[PDB]
Amino acid sequence: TIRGVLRSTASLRQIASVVNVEATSFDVLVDKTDMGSGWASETAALSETATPQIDRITIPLHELAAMPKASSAFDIETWLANRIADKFARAEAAAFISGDGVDKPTGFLTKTKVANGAWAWGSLGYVATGAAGDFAAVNASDAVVDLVYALGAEYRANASFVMNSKTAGAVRKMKDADGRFLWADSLAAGEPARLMGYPVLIAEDMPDIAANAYAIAFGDFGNGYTIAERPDLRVLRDPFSAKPHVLFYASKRVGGDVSDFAAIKLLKFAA
Amino acid sequence: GWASETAALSETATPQIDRITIPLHELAAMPKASQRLLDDSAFDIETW
Amino acid sequence: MMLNEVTAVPGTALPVAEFRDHLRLGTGFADLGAEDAALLSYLRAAIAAIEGRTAKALISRGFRLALTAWRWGDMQTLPIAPVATVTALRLVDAAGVETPVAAGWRLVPDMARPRIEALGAMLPMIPTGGRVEIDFTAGFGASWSALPVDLAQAVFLLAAQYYELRHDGAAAMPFGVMALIERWRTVRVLGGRP
Amino acid sequence: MMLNEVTAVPGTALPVAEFRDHLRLGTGFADLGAEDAALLSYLRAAIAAIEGRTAKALISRGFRLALTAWRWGDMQTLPIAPVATVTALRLVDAAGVETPVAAGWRLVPDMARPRIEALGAMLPMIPTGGRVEIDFTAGFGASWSALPVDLAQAVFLLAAQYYELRHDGAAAMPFGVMALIERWRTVRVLGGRP
Amino acid sequence: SVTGRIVAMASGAGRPVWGPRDTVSLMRTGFAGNPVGFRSVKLIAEATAAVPLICPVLDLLRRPNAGQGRAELFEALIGQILLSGNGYLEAVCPEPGVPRELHVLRSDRMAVVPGADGWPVGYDYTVGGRKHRFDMTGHPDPICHIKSFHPTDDHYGLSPMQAAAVALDVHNAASAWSKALLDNAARPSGAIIYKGADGQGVLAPEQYERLIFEMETHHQGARNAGRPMLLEGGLDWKPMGFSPSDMEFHETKAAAAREIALAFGVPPMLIGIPGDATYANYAEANRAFYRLTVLPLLTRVSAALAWWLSGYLGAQIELKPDLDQVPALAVERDQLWARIGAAGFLSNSEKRVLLGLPPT
Amino acid sequence: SVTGRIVAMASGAGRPVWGPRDTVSLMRTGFAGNPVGFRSVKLIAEATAAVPLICPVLDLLRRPNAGQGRAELFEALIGQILLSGNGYLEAVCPEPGVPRELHVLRSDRMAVVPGADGWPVGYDYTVGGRKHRFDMTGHPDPICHIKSFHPTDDHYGLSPMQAAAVALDVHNAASAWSKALLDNAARPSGAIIYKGADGQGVLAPEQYERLIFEMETHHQGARNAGRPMLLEGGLDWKPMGFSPSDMEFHETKAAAAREIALAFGVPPMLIGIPGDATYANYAEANRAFYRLTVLPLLTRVSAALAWWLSGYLGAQIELKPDLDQVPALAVERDQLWARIGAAGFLSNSEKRVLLGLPPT
Lengths: 271, 48, 194, 194, 360, 360
Known about the structure:
The structure is cut from a larger assembly and holds two copies of chain A, two copies of chain C (194 residues) and two copies of chain E (360 residues). Chain A is an alpha/beta fold. Chain A is built from four helices and 13 strands. Chain C has 194 residues and is of the alpha+beta class. In chain C, a hairpin with a 5-residue loop joins β4 (91-92) and β5 (98-99). The longest helix of chain C has 18 residues, at 36-53. A three-stranded antiparallel β-sheet of chain E has the order 3-2-7. A three-stranded antiparallel β-sheet of chain E has the order 4-5-6, with no helix packed on it. Chain E has a two-stranded antiparallel sheet with strand order 1-10. The two termini of chain E are 50 Å apart. In chain E, α3 packs parallel to α9. Chain E is elongated. Chain E has helices at 2-11, 25-30, 35-48, 57-62, 70-84, 160-163, 165-183, 205-216, 250-264, 268-271, 285-292, 295-308, 331-341, 349-355, and strands spanning 53-54, 86-92, 101-104, 110-113, 122-125, 134-135, 143-147, 191-194, 235-238, 320-321. In chain E, a hairpin with an 8-residue loop joins β2 and β3 (101-104). Chains in contact: A-D, A-E, B-C, B-D, C-D, E-F. Chains E and F meet through α3, α5, α7, α9 and α10 of E and α1, α6, α7, β8 and α8 of F. Chain B: This is Phage major capsid protein, HK97 family.
């Protein structure tokens, strides 16, 4: 049996809202503001209090394609089908997190972030850690806990952290003034998988800790990020074009950006 | 075409389609009747 | 399929002044020109011998290929092999009217198979009782210098022979006349229907 | 598949000064008198006889291989054998848009079977009617000194023969012309469909 | 079951799985192409339709739809199983129980969907580029999918034509060898060699029409067979032969014509191919045909109609071949009636219960 | 039927679908051309017409139309099914019920129309440039369309001659090989070679008429077989041979003549082709013929007449072959009467109900 390198599988697919769509695009419809109702006066005109301005966000439903040429110990049809499904499960994971606008789903990091407390609708909110290189030196994890408690109590019913491996490394490297590992205290524990009472998703397409990078996200992505897709995978078992190489054609179409800008909060490693 | 496939016609020009919108306006009339006239007349003006 | 030539070679394009260097006539005589009328008579007699054994052309004079029915449904391999830029497949009618046709025909260059394959899966049809002449200029180059030199040597090995013996008098080289010709002959193994 | 040379030899690359020494040096009449530019015309005739029997190139001239359909799915053996560095694999269409490619293929050099051998199983497909065209530089080296000297001696054994006797006159050496060539000929045993 | 849930996510849930690539080309080259592959399927598919069945529901089977009878249905059904290893039956149910339409869907244009738990959720009828997406996420499950046994695949059948796909291409090309040999061959019955004074010399068209007319009139044909044929100086007649005359791949075609009949399981005696006498006298080879490749095939499809159609009814129904008054099994019925009829020790009602009779 | 709408659009509704072009040429080259393809269809079509039927409706079948009897109708009907895979029956109804005219429309000039839901709406009888456009958008549906089984096509039959179309062209051309060999062949029984003093030399017309008259009188013919034939200087007699004498494609013709008989399903013993003894003694081969390729064909056509003609009546009628007093099945009738007749344990009326008699 032919082996391959085992890549990361966690993909933000299982915590975001997966919607089977059949058309060319998926239009989510979110109001931007409140009703604005006031307490009425007993002798006043009292008319036209306000109306929420709605907004259509378009999931463009892009397509993803990989085209390998095939060029009896192991059987290529099953193996290449088990590799290209993995690559389509992994290459859309980068687009879900840091994809840009052109021909691919725009990830939640590329949505013009604004510091929380001055949060408006068109952006995502972040909280600063302190010094630019890493977590704060005096009190580590204060950035983590106020990232949790700067989101909103309705979305924190089912919210999760999104990191890569070597940011969860730097989280588990946090220790008290005796060096006793605030998260998973002993050297015998392991991954506790319940950071601050919330699950952790190790998604490798997140950036690592840098001068300004947003290496930790937290949110109810079921309301936040909408993955609209078509469930099938095209299989053109092509017997033409090149006699020498089969050149199988496999494509899945998928789209997605943020549906709710209030659900996702980011951790900026700066001041 | 017949011989144009050899020289050109690598693709045949597809029909460029066009959407014509019916804007669907409304036709509304609001005549004003009096309450005195609606009550005095033997003729049912409200159904006329 | 008649395959005549529109124009012959000019004669001034033949290397009579270099063939005279080959045959060791003489260097600095004041006459120097008593053989010019006959040296190109043997160069044209040795090129035309090698143009028939090789089915090549060698001076790129213009041809006229007047034929009536197509040999195969679409291909029409041309006889004179090294071709370039088929001018005109003017389709004559039963009598008179000659209408040149762009017709959607291509040209596949090759030294072995100089086809004229059509792109619309059928060459232009032929008016019953009328021919389809094809003007094309086929050969290696315009001047003598554009030839493959081994084929140019096979003219000089052969036209020197006609100059040295006049009648058919009998008289083994590694690369003789024949061994230089043989990579330019047409190697065919079909005697079939298609 | 026309495979015309882009440029010929310069003529100054050929060892005319050395071939005068293979003709009569160390033994002979004197340097004697030889039409210098004649001796260049027999070297070009002996190289072009050995370029054809061996399918080699010997001076590293520039070639242009313009063929319509790929023979295999990916392989494309190049005929002129000692190759180096495809200049370009530009791809013209039926109208002449001439869109080159810069990746997808890796020339695998070899004196036996030079190839194109694209990556994977996809070799650049051909526009319908638009012949593919490959420019490459094939041969041993730029100067005469970069050649295998046994193949260079087969030129001098042959170009001297065209100098010593002009017409096709009759005349078994151990390493003659033919025995020095046979380790450079192409040994093929395929007459089949692939 | 539990293994199936893991198997799905390997191939991909919710996406169509196609299986065999060439099954559309084996039909034209193996069932419309050669007579041996043609007759072998027609011999079986017309045999399974002739076998009666034992149960209402059979009223549907007798008249499934317009223009497609009872016997015509199983010829279409088994004719897809022998060709592509898969049988399909669409049911149209205006009514809740016993749906009054059956349709043999061809297995070229049908594709499976593995779904979540490995057992199928979708079947996709794809003609052109247009699909249907039948749904299996319900109880009546509108398509019975009859699989031939396939050990390596989890969703399709093996289609005996795929196992004989080498012997089809031998039999197709050896038969086309002799066709194009009779169509591309130049044999002469001789050659009048004319050398001349030189080693080469043509003869003038005056002399050549003399040579045709003395050959056309006086030498060719049945009526001129054997004229003494004076040859003067220069002329000579070399008679040619034709050294392989008969038998161009005659046995390798006849061995391949037996391996096609071997794979579908028909005996060589029934189909009519030549060969050594294996079976004796057609009371066996027809009985072997309805016991090794018809009745095992028919009791396997009828076991799937007994379960798929019972999903439309409330009560489950069995549906089996008759294995009685099928006249190829009369030698198994003589042999069993004369055994117990001659057993005089056990009484009269004690052997009506053995032979299958209503007791008295 | 639910998927019927999808396949209809791809073909194109309201437009005629033709199918196979070369169908009319297989008739002239494979049924009017060779005896094996000729006898095989005539052997079947004259057998299915001879089989009686079991039901009124049969009064139409007994006298369908003028000049075309009962037995003559099924020869025309089955003779189109074996030739082109399709049978057609126009019904002309001056009267509302049980239309008193039947006409076998030939399937060369008939074309289908797919219509809306995939099942046909039009049939087009196309002679010259003239069409007719029969209509199927009604209840009586005036043409029954009997299909042979075709797995790849959705509208026509397969026509066993198409499956044997290579073996027909072998048998047509191997038989025409020996014909044109007997017509184009120059064999001489010798050659009187006259060289001369030179390598070449003719003989004068004085000497040449001398050479004929001693060859015409004294050497040719049966009565001059073996004269000692003095040869002087220069003359020489080289006797020629004819090296392949018999057997020009003799076995490949005899193998292709069996594969044609294989596809239509006739046994080699019935048609008369030579070959190894597969069946024994004509009690088998005639019983095999009416069980593998006649009675399955006849019970499939009669099942289409049982449904198309019942659409003109009110009550549905069954119509099946008799499978009784057809004298090729007597070995299956001896075997079943002597089995139950020798079963002496069960009583008299208990075996009249088995053999099919009205009990007394």
